[PDB]
Scaffold this active site. Structure first.
Site, PDB file in Angstrom:
ATOM      1  N   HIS A 168       0.769  -1.277   0.000  1.00  0.00           N
ATOM      2  CA  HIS A 168       0.000   0.000   0.000  1.00  0.00           C
ATOM      3  C   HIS A 168       0.801   1.332   0.000  1.00  0.00           C
ATOM      4  O   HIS A 168       0.248   2.381  -0.327  1.00  0.00           O
ATOM      5  CB  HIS A 168      -1.054   0.063   1.132  1.00  0.00           C
ATOM      6  CG  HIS A 168      -0.534   0.008   2.544  1.00  0.00           C
ATOM      7  ND1 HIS A 168      -0.440  -1.175   3.256  1.00  0.00           N
ATOM      8  CD2 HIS A 168      -0.182   0.991   3.410  1.00  0.00           C
ATOM      9  CE1 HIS A 168       0.001  -0.919   4.474  1.00  0.00           C
ATOM     10  NE2 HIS A 168       0.156   0.389   4.594  1.00  0.00           N
ATOM     11  N   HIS A 204       6.123   7.398   5.729  1.00  0.00           N
ATOM     12  CA  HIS A 204       5.692   6.886   4.457  1.00  0.00           C
ATOM     13  C   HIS A 204       5.014   8.001   3.708  1.00  0.00           C
ATOM     14  O   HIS A 204       4.851   9.114   4.224  1.00  0.00           O
ATOM     15  CB  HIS A 204       4.724   5.710   4.667  1.00  0.00           C
ATOM     16  CG  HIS A 204       3.487   6.116   5.368  1.00  0.00           C
ATOM     17  ND1 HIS A 204       3.379   6.142   6.734  1.00  0.00           N
ATOM     18  CD2 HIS A 204       2.331   6.589   4.888  1.00  0.00           C
ATOM     19  CE1 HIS A 204       2.193   6.622   7.065  1.00  0.00           C
ATOM     20  NE2 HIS A 204       1.538   6.890   5.952  1.00  0.00           N
ATOM     21  N   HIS A 242       1.849   9.113   0.564  1.00  0.00           N
ATOM     22  CA  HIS A 242       0.708   8.852  -0.312  1.00  0.00           C
ATOM     23  C   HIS A 242       0.896   9.736  -1.536  1.00  0.00           C
ATOM     24  O   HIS A 242       1.341  10.872  -1.383  1.00  0.00           O
ATOM     25  CB  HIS A 242      -0.626   9.176   0.383  1.00  0.00           C
ATOM     26  CG  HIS A 242      -0.774   8.516   1.729  1.00  0.00           C
ATOM     27  ND1 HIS A 242      -1.455   7.336   1.893  1.00  0.00           N
ATOM     28  CD2 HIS A 242      -0.270   8.823   2.941  1.00  0.00           C
ATOM     29  CE1 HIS A 242      -1.425   6.973   3.164  1.00  0.00           C
ATOM     30  NE2 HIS A 242      -0.674   7.839   3.812  1.00  0.00           N
ATOM     31  N   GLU A 270      -3.756  13.243   1.027  1.00  0.00           N
ATOM     32  CA  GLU A 270      -4.912  12.768   1.779  1.00  0.00           C
ATOM     33  C   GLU A 270      -5.667  13.977   2.354  1.00  0.00           C
ATOM     34  O   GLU A 270      -6.823  14.185   2.027  1.00  0.00           O
ATOM     35  CB  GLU A 270      -4.448  11.785   2.858  1.00  0.00           C
ATOM     36  CG  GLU A 270      -3.765  10.565   2.264  1.00  0.00           C
ATOM     37  CD  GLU A 270      -3.925   9.350   3.109  1.00  0.00           C
ATOM     38  OE1 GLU A 270      -3.503   9.354   4.286  1.00  0.00           O
ATOM     39  OE2 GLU A 270      -4.474   8.365   2.584  1.00  0.00           O
ATOM     40  N   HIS A 294       3.865  11.358   5.773  1.00  0.00           N
ATOM     41  CA  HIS A 294       3.417  11.107   7.131  1.00  0.00           C
ATOM     42  C   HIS A 294       4.545  10.558   7.986  1.00  0.00           C
ATOM     43  O   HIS A 294       5.070   9.490   7.681  1.00  0.00           O
ATOM     44  CB  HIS A 294       2.274  10.113   7.098  1.00  0.00           C
ATOM     45  CG  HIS A 294       1.030  10.704   6.529  1.00  0.00           C
ATOM     46  ND1 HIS A 294      -0.027   9.948   6.074  1.00  0.00           N
ATOM     47  CD2 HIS A 294       0.669  11.995   6.355  1.00  0.00           C
ATOM     48  CE1 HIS A 294      -0.978  10.746   5.627  1.00  0.00           C
ATOM     49  NE2 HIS A 294      -0.587  11.988   5.802  1.00  0.00           N
ATOM     50  N   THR A 332      -5.358   6.416   8.364  1.00  0.00           N
ATOM     51  CA  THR A 332      -6.009   6.551   7.058  1.00  0.00           C
ATOM     52  C   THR A 332      -5.991   5.291   6.213  1.00  0.00           C
ATOM     53  O   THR A 332      -6.486   5.313   5.095  1.00  0.00           O
ATOM     54  CB  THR A 332      -5.450   7.713   6.244  1.00  0.00           C
ATOM     55  OG1 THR A 332      -4.159   7.367   5.791  1.00  0.00           O
ATOM     56  CG2 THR A 332      -5.416   8.988   7.044  1.00  0.00           C
TER      57      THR A 332
HETATM   58  C1  LIG Z   1       0.835  -2.317  12.214  1.00  0.00           C
HETATM   59  C2  LIG Z   1      -0.414  -1.787  12.902  1.00  0.00           C
HETATM   60  C3  LIG Z   1      -0.754  -2.632  14.166  1.00  0.00           C
HETATM   61  C4  LIG Z   1       0.145  -2.066  15.254  1.00  0.00           C
HETATM   62  C5  LIG Z   1       0.682  -0.713  14.774  1.00  0.00           C
HETATM   63  C6  LIG Z   1      -0.208  -0.413  13.580  1.00  0.00           C
HETATM   64  C7  LIG Z   1       0.129   0.686  12.589  1.00  0.00           C
HETATM   65  C8  LIG Z   1       0.383   2.018  13.245  1.00  0.00           C
HETATM   66  C9  LIG Z   1       0.888   3.004  12.190  1.00  0.00           C
HETATM   67  C10 LIG Z   1      -0.004   3.053  10.997  1.00  0.00           C
HETATM   68  C11 LIG Z   1       0.050   4.154  10.118  1.00  0.00           C
HETATM   69  C12 LIG Z   1      -0.843   4.176   9.015  1.00  0.00           C
HETATM   70  O1  LIG Z   1      -0.878   5.193   8.022  1.00  0.00           O
HETATM   71  S1  LIG Z   1      -1.389   6.751   8.425  1.00  0.00           S
HETATM   72  N1  LIG Z   1      -1.647   7.206   7.037  1.00  0.00           N
HETATM   73  O2  LIG Z   1      -2.587   6.578   9.169  1.00  0.00           O
HETATM   74  O3  LIG Z   1      -0.290   7.338   9.069  1.00  0.00           O
HETATM   75  C13 LIG Z   1      -1.748   3.170   8.836  1.00  0.00           C
HETATM   76  C14 LIG Z   1      -1.813   2.117   9.709  1.00  0.00           C
HETATM   77  C15 LIG Z   1      -0.956   2.018  10.799  1.00  0.00           C
HETATM   78  C16 LIG Z   1      -1.102   0.807  11.696  1.00  0.00           C
HETATM   79  C17 LIG Z   1      -1.328  -0.515  10.947  1.00  0.00           C
HETATM   80  C18 LIG Z   1      -1.539  -1.692  11.884  1.00  0.00           C
HETATM   81 ZN   LIG Z   2      -0.235   7.917   5.811  1.00  0.00          ZN
END
Ligand SMILES: C[C@@]12CCC[C@H]1[C@@H]1CCc3cc(OS(N)(=O)=O)ccc3[C@H]1CC2
Ligand SMILES: [Zn+2]
Length: 258
Positions: free
Chosen positions: A62, A92, A94, A104, A117, A196
């Site tokens: 993604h 990361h 987008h 976003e 981000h 997001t």
């Molecule tokens: C790995 C995980 C479980 C424990 C930690 C979790 C991360 C935390 C950071 C993160 C940033 C994201 O992108 S954003 N666009 O919202 O910053 C989107 C998702 C997650 C989750 C995914 C799920």
């Molecule tokens: Zn993001």
């Protein structure tokens, strides 16, 4: 049939697996600059990245992410609207298929070519998995990218993307300094929101910088050569990996600046 950004698995489908997608504090949002209220009580943001230790760069199907050692307070965000100290986990991006979309957050409905981000988690919760279950668990610093002059501090990232083209691929990515990705001003907007992508958890204090960074067309073209697919699967360019603006509902966006 995992989630993604396409017609059959994209943002409009996410609520089926993640019902919080229709929740009360979802991200991103449109930042209406004239309605955001200046909050003179908001502190300047404190960004302490001098001792940041980058570890790896990863294509997760993604986005791509640069991961940091978050086992100690080496690269931390504090101040601004935050209580306590938040450790940098990863950054990361987008981005779009064309320069007129990709961000976003939007600003008076304007879309930027991309959005960076920097994801941080509150050390009072000990680990990021615990932090995502708390309303003040994460702080994400958002920076808009426009296309113009190159960003020299981004080039080391761009140059290794050939090595992580497809989902699953990772590479060593040590000694990267994320200070090279920041604009001059730390003036910001802030509001309570969410991740997001799935799981869309409502755990994020959003801090969105007003000042974009400029990147070159060549830099963003390299983002667009990444692939959503794994190696051996039909090639599907990693473009338009952004969630659209969500309803603001009962939230106020606050500005740090007049
Ligand atoms: C790995 C995980 C479980 C424990 C930690 C979790 C991360 C935390 C950071 C993160 C940033 C994201 O992108 S954003 N666009 O919202 O910053 C989107 C998702 C997650 C989750 C995914 C799920
Ligand atoms: Zn993001």
């Amino acid at each position: 049939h995992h989630w993604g950004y396409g017609k059959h698995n994209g943002p409009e489908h996410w609520h089926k697996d993640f019902p919080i997608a229709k929740g009360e504090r979802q991200s991103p949002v449109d930042i209406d600059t004239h309605t955001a209220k200046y909050d003179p009580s908001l502190k300047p943001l404190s960004v302490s990245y001098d001792q940041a230790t980058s570890l790896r760069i990863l294509n997760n199907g993604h986005s791509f992410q640069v991961t940091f050692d978050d086992s100690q307070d080496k690269a931390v965000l504090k101040g601004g609207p935050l209580d306590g100290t938040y450790r940098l986990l990863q950054f990361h991006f987008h981005w779009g298929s064309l320069d007129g979309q990709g961000s976003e957050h939007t600003v008076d409905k304007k879309k930027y070519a991309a959005e960076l981000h920097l994801v941080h988690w509150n050390t009072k919760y000990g680990d990021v998995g615990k932090a995502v279950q708390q309303p003040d668990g994460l702080a994400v610093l958002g920076i808009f990218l426009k296309v113009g002059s190159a960003k020299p501090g981004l080039q080391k990232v761009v140059d290794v993307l050939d090595s992580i083209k497809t989902e699953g691929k990772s590479a060593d990515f040590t000694n990267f300094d994320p200070r090279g990705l920041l604009p001059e001003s730390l003036d910001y907007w802030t509001y309570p929101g969410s991740l997001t992508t799935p799981p869309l958890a409502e755990c994020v204090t959003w801090i969105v910088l007003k000042e974009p960074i400029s990147v070159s067309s060549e830099q963003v073209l390299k983002f667009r050569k990444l692939n959503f697919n794994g190696e051996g699967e039909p090639e599907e360019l990693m473009v338009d990996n952004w969630r659209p603006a969500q309803p603001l509902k009962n939230r106020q966006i606050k500005a740090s600046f007049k």
